[PDB]
Amino acid sequence: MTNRYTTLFANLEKRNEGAFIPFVTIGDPNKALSFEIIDTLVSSGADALELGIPFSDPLADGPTIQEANIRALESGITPKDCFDILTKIRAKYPHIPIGLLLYANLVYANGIENFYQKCLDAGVDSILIADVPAHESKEFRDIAKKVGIAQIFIAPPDASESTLKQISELGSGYTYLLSRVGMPVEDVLTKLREYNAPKPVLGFGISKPEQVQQAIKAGAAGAISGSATVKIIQNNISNKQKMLNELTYFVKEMKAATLN
Amino acid sequence: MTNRYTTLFANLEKRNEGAFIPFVTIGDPNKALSFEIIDTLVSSGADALELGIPFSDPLADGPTIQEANIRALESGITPKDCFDILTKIRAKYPHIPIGLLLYANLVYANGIENFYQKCLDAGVDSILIADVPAHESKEFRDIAKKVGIAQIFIAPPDASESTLKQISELGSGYTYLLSRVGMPVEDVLTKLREYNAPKPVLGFGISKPEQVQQAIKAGAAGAISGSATVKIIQNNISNKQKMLNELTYFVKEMKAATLN
Amino acid sequence: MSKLNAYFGEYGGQFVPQILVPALDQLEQEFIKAQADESFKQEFKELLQEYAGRPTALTKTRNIVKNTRTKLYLKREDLLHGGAHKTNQVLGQALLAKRMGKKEIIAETGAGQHGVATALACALLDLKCRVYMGAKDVERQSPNVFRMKLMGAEVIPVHSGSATLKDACNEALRDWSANYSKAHYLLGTAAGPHPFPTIVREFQRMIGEETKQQMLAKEGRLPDAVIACVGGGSNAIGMFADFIDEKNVKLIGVEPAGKGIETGEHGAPLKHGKTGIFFGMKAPLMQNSDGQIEESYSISAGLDFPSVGPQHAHLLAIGRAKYASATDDEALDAFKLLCKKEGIIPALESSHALAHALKLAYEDPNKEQLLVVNLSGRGDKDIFTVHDILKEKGE
Amino acid sequence: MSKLNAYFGEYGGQFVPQILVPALDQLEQEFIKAQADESFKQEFKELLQEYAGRPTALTKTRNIVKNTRTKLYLKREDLLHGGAHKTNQVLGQALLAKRMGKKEIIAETGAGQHGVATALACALLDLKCRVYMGAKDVERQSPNVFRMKLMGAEVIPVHSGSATLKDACNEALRDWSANYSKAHYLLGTAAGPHPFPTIVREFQRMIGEETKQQMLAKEGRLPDAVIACVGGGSNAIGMFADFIDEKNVKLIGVEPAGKGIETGEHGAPLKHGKTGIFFGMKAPLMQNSDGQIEESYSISAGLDFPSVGPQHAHLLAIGRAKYASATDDEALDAFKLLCKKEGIIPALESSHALAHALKLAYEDPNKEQLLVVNLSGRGDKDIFTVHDILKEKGE
Ligand SMILES: [Ca+2]
Ligand SMILES: [Ca+2]
Ligand SMILES: [Ca+2]
Ligand SMILES: [Ca+2]
């Protein structure tokens, strides 16, 4: 295959840089401000986007992300409202990799393919379903290959070599790694490299620019910041102008840590 | 035998009158006022006295008498304090029948005979132990015949003819009857007359002069008022002068109902 | 035969007013006929088993005395329906009153445990239940009054006198004096006038009867001792009765020491009381030099009773049973231990027996011992009490 | 064999994040070895019998359906240690975690019932017990928090998000994600990811297993139906499991209708819910048109759960079991009836099953019927709730 991610990772290693992918949940804190948040994320130098769609019971996320699904739902955000934002973003920024972090019931209710079609029409490139493990992705992955969306899988550092091999083969776009920086991280990438997994990205606990620099080192194609980007939204809810500035500053300093 | 009661009941039927015997608990509401209460009872025309000694747990008495054992104990009344009052009364009023209404533990603790001796030294003529039935009086009655105090027994209207016969033979002084005025009362006295019981007295629920008059009628040697006399003490605790006047008036109007 | 012995070596008797004697004689005769009627005995067993939950477990503690060589067993009367042993003899008396032809039942209670047990029995056996209660106790026991009312019982607050348990006994007894032809009085413990001490023993017998047969099948021998708390005597005579003729089994009863025997605020007349006459019986009494009965105290309401059953006082004067004391703090620490080491919340009454057993284990930790504690009841009722005493100190 | 079916006709599964899969696989393998180890099976039985109180009674009601020809029986899980059926599967899982070599146990609770049951098991089996709890639930449940602390458990209030039961599951699960090598997660009901629905069924099986053998020895035939309330599915699958292969025994589960199904404030997704994926399983869900899970409601906290176990949803789609509803008022009136007619205070959860049985009796009063109600728990915990709803109306 060849998606927007393959174009990005080849352009990046050509320039010999790592990928910084911020995570922000769509509709947080409300629909109008959410688009401006996503807008400033791209303008401030994000290579790819990792956008969550608000769920009622995010049993896999920590408190910071939990408070952010709540903010969006309390304001009335709908999957429809999310596709409106995803559509308006890709209309402005073509060929910018956009992935979605979803919970399964948003996909299963109202039809798996029916939901997958709305994603591709909105310009989405990849989908990571948090509560669907690799050994139970068959129904979701088949539809993913028919519509043309890459299915992303999490590679936790304590799975079977059998399960870790299975994630390498089922994956596409990139591989989400729960390994920390500060089984060790290198020995995880070694198994993923031997099994031809998609390019690895680190996600868990990436908050400071230090952690990003020590993530492209030790051999990772990029790094995702979940809580660190959402927390800037949480701490500036009343102050729209300061929020976006603290946000643009965050993306620039985190992107600078992906060079060389 | 021939006690102060035999002298009284013969003098009364000679004058063809019934006996009015007020009940007051000794030491109620305090030691000094208690003697004046007992004093005014005799001066106002009482034929005999029925005096209780304060007990902690009077499980056989009603609320009015209960509140009166409490008043005396709260003021510090002792069996010693009671004998002082009994002694001072008989010193003033010789040959006036005085009975005691006691609970067994006051007798059993510190010796049965030892307690019975203090009673006779105080001038007491009879003792009714509320919580000692006829079939279990042997230890108490033997000592009663040795010291010379009459043992009084209650004749409830629903005991066996065997038990009712037993009370007639063990009794002395008079017989306390729980029969009401308003098995019937007459049929009770019939069994007591055939068994040569001591002269019968009615006690339960004798409050108004009406009930006294309808008690000497239907064949009873006398009548005891328990709650009615104690209640006058209860309703005038703060007013010493009104209490004694309402008390002397009560005894006179209750005694008038024993004539003819 | 139309008579049963009313005494235990000059302890006990029938020291009631004359008006109550025909009530006691009638109740005695019906009880004798009941123990001969086999349809009564089978209905009592089906009631205890299929409804009350008998037989109750005999648990072996795992951790509370692990540091010793003592094998400590618990007779699980907390698993009985109602959460206490009282249910046993309450079902018996109510069934007994049902075949006297009576539909009404008079009862009194302080904490509410006996009242709740009387209410649930009268609800199952379709009996009109009147429970007397001190007006102050009604105020302090809102959950237990609501339990009693939920099961169709008439709660009659008593405001006269002290307006507490001593005044509810007076109302319940005088009520029974006037109404014994239609109503029965369900006495709460193994004390009072004959035949109540004998009846309650026979309706709590299956406690000791089950332990003996359970202990034979579990460990193989008879236990070295059985330990039970002694308030009025109900649950302790339940355990002792079937062990009295086993000469090599010690019988240990534990009375409450309260704030300390030296402080006077206790409830242990069996070893610190003069014999007297009270509650229609001749028995040890907490009394002053004049004969007035003194106020008793315990941290658990079930043991706050200034006298004791007659058969216990007898068993002490014969040398058959030893009786010990446990303070508030010893029962409290035994309470907290059974929650933490085992998984059981005991009644603060039962914790007095447990605290004594913990003594026998920790004082000779290398001694091979097999002990039984009669866990007379659940501790959920004492949750509020333990929490406030712990917070008043440091918790 | 190293695998067990995770589905019940496309219901159930293991829809957890990848980080939790090795925890589930490990727990599955240990459970299979445990069911083959006979020293485990005997220790579980000695635990249920000599400690938890099994077998529990099977009571025949005397008055509540006397006006009909229905013979109504109650499986007395209220007489179990802890006052509810939860103790059964909590003792099993804790014993299972003890032989995985683990000393720690993670748990979550809302009302506190599961928390108390986990605490007493970990106290007896010497396990370090951490229970998560919503900060709002901690405030509303002072007696149950003090019970848990008395038995050595660490109560961890969760202040993030809604600060209630939904947030304690998040903490407990993420805790288990990081710490499954040393700690086990004691799931509270027969729902969630495989193998939890299968494990809980096997540790509540003895409910139905005892009833079948008790009913054969008591009445002689198998009952016409067994009725049990359905919150998550724990106590209902406990009763149904051994009756599934008895083709002529109806299986009736009763979900809460709350203030009325037409009002939306209910907890009955089995017959009013769209199938979805939640809590690591595929099962009926109270959800909106977009996929957000909706808030459920019941007067009893034990039934306030917007999903249901997988085997129940399967049993409905095969026609093997019927599932009904009972409103707040129907369970309340069934609560008040069992107190007055029988002598039992039922759990408001159990009263939903009872209210339905009272329907089957009163609707065809001349029909010869033999019904079983799984009395899943005691009602002492609901005393305060029933009193306030009665006073808010007219009592
Ligand atoms: Ca006291
Ligand atoms: Ca020593
Ligand atoms: Ca809810
Ligand atoms: Ca009909």
Numbering used by the authors:
A (entry chain A), B (entry chain A): 1 to 182, 192 to 269
C (entry chain B), D (entry chain B): 1 to 395
Task: Reproduce text from the manuscript describing this model.
Tryptophan synthase (TrpAB) is a pyridoxal 5′-phosphate (PLP)-dependent enzyme that participates in the final two steps of tryptophan synthesis in plants, fungi and bacteria. The enzyme consists of two protein chains, α (TrpA) and β (TrpB), that operate as a linear αββα heterotetrameric complex containing two functional TrpAB units. In bacteria, TrpA and TrpB are encoded by usually adjacent trpA and trpB genes that belong to the highly regulated tryptophan-biosynthesis operon. The TrpA subunit converts indole-3-glycerol phosphate (IGP) into glyceraldehyde 3-phosphate (G3P) and indole (IND).
Similarly, in TrpB (amino-acid residues 4–407) the N-terminal SNA sequence and the C-terminal end (residues 403–407) are not present in the respective chains B and D. The other ortholog, FtTrpAB, crystallized in space group C2221 and the asymmetric unit contains only one αβ module. This structure was solved by experimental SAD phasing and was refined to 2.80 Å resolution. In FtTrpAB, TrpA (chain A; residues 1–269) lacks the N-terminal SNA sequence and residues 183–191, while in TrpB (chain B; residues 1–396) the C-terminal residue is not present. The level of pairwise sequence identity between the TrpBs from these organisms ranges from 51% to 59%, with the exception of the FtTrpB/StTrpB pair, which show 81% conserved residues. The enzyme from F. tularensis, which is the most closely related to StTrpAB, shows even better agreement, with an r.m.s.d. of 0.8 Å for corresponding StTrpA Cα atoms. The structures of the FtTrpAB and SpTrpAB αββα heterotetramers provide a new set of high-quality models and enable comparison of the intermolecular tunnel connecting the TrpA and TrpB catalytic pockets. In contrast to the active sites, the composition of the tunnel, which is mostly encompassed by TrpB, varies between the orthologs, although generally SpTrpAB shares some features with MtTrpAB while FtTrpAB is similar to StTrpAB. The MVC is indirectly connected to the βH6 element of the COMM domain and to TrpA via either a histidine (βHis285Sp and βHis294Mt) or a phenylalanine (βPhe279Ft, βPhe280St), switching between hydrophobic Phe–Phe contacts (FtTrpB and StTrpB) and the well defined His–Tyr hydrogen bond seen in MtTrpB and most likely to be present in the activated form of SpTrpB. While no monovalent cations have been modeled in the current structures, by analogy to the data collected from the MtTrpAB and StTrpAB systems the MVC must be created by βTyr311Sp, βGly313Sp, βAla273Sp, βGly237Sp and βThr275Sp in SpTrpAB and βPhe305Ft, βSer307Ft, βGly267Ft, βGly231Ft in FtTrpAB, with βPro269Ft replacing the threonine residue. The specific activity order is as follows: FtTrpAB >> MtTrpAB, SpTrpAB >> LpPhTrpAB.
